[PDB]
């Protein structure tokens, strides 16, 4: 199947439009400054909202070298 994603025309922060940046796996779009941390520039790649970046349910890379 085709990954026909959907993007909100309203920011998840203030439900306003304009300069939006939408998540890959989540339809939410945000305003650059409204985000936390706020984007000053558009990221190249699969961008994820705060919830997604916090959704590291799996092992967060155990760096026990000792």
């Amino acid at each position: 199947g085709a990954m026909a994603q959907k993007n909100e025309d309203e920011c998840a922060v203030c439900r306003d439009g304009g300069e939006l940046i939408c998540c890959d796996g989540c339809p939410r779009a945000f305003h650059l400054a409204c985000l936390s941390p706020p984007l000053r520039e558009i990221p190249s790649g699969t961008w994820r909202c705060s919830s997604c970046l916090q959704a590291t349910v799996q092992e967060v890379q155990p760096r026990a070298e000792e």
């Binding site: 994603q5 993007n7 025309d9 309203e10 439900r15 306003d16 439009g17 304009g18 300069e19 939006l20 940046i21 939408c22 998540c23 890959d24 779009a29 984007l39 558009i42 990221p43 190249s44 790649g45 961008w47």
Partner: peptide
């Protein structure tokens, strides 16, 4: 990023 440039609602 899935960037959009819609109309501002304000």
């Amino acid at each position: 990023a899935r960037t959009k440039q819609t109309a501002r609602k304000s």
